[PDB]
Amino acid sequence: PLVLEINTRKSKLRDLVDRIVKTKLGMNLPLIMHGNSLLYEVGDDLDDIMVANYNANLEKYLSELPSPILNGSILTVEDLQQELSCKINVKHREEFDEEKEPEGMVLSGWT
């Protein structure tokens, strides 16, 4: 169970997908879940309505997603092809060090 410190009001889903899920966890076809709701999926098999909705979610602040990601939210992240699967505990943090935490978030518990 990883810990993600992040400003949930100022960071967008896109920031989390690109900087954590794709980059650090190495998941190129992620499925991101919060409870029973899918926040994100990617693939050429998804129909145009689902892609358009997921595209809209990417541009939303985490605290304003259809299933809001807030302090203490638990996300589940699985990949379509790789066996990788992760739970991420979200901890809200207001401010980050401009040169030590330049990505505006901090992932703890990861190798």
Added chain:
Amino acid sequence: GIARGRLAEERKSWRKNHPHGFVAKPETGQDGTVNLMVWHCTIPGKAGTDWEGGFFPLTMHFSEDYPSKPPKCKFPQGFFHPNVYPSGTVCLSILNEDYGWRPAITVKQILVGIQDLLDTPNPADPAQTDGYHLFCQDPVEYKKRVKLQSKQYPA
């Protein structure tokens, strides 16, 4: 968490391999939520049958007790088939919690089982008098009703 975890597995499994012409996907709400507990599906009628060319919508409703308990599967209200209630509920042995259901049954197996039921109704499970009668006592009128309905559901 048991239901969610199993539906996430079924979602991945379905996306990587499913039979041709079928659709199965979690419902997207007008608020943007994508709900793993409610899936919208499409079952094609089999070629070489009166169902041919029909692409039939079905909703699968899972509960927090899935997969200990089976989903409820519904065609549209008024769908014509001897084993479908007026409400749209489909009667299928493997969907019966009391006897045929087993946790290991997949969404693929359910939808293929329903596709099989379309052209091969179960005479012991009559759900609607309309379909069941025509089926049992007037096959020619039944056949016409099926082919007309197939035309209502093009791809």
